[PDB]
Design a protein around this ligand. Structure first.
Ligand SMILES: NC(=O)c1cc(Cl)ccc1N
Ligand SMILES: [Cl-]
Ligand SMILES: [Cl-]
Ligand SMILES: [Cl-]
Length: 163
């Protein structure tokens, strides 16, 4: 466990994280993909061996001794708002189980379903709130990675509002 488990946000490539494991915003088929998934494929390509897993699940594959947790958020282009919301909640619950199983003291995590899988909507608050519901009961340091300057500000304010 971390000595005083914390949330932090950084605006940078998750492939340069300083944490003990990474969460990939994966597709269900274990393909190289785009955005976070493409950066993760370039940095840890060995982790894509048998990484296919269903929507709403997470599957960990080791790159050497470094764990890559492939977490599959719903594509809101295909899911109803209702079903998509349930699968996005479920994907983060499976990340919390894997983080706990691995015994890591820190994890790098992107906001699932907020890019190509967003169905054209702003899902910062929806995705971040499902991240908190899952990770609040874990004692790993959680470092959230984003690329937009306005998103960094809003994530930081959300963390600070809980004090
Ligand atoms: N590689 C990343 O950290 C990243 C890339 C995109 Cl396009 C969006 C969010 C991210 N965290
Ligand atoms: Cl960067
Ligand atoms: Cl996405
Ligand atoms: Cl972002």
């Amino acid at each position: 466990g971390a000595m005083a488990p914390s949330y932090r946000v950084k605006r940078m490539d998750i492939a340069k994280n300083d944490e003990e494991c990474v969460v990939n915003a994966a597709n269900p088929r274990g393909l190289p993909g785009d955005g976070v998934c493409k950066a993760v494929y370039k940095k840890w390509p060995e982790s894509f061996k048998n990484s296919a897993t269903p929507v709403g699940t997470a599957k960990t594959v080791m790159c050497g001794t470094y764990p890559v947790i492939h977490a599959v958020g719903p594509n809101f282009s295909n899911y109803t708002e209702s079903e998509g919301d349930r699968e996005l909640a479920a994907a983060y619950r499976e990340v919390a189980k894997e983080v706990t199983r691995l015994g890591v003291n820190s994890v790098a995590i992107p906001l699932l379903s907020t890019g190509v899988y967003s169905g054209g909507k702003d899902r910062l608050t929806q995705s971040l709130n499902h991240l908190f519901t899952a990770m609040d009961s874990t004692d790993a340091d959680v470092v959230i990675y984003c690329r937009d300057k306005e998103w960094e500000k809003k994530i930081s304010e959300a963390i600070q509002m809980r004090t």
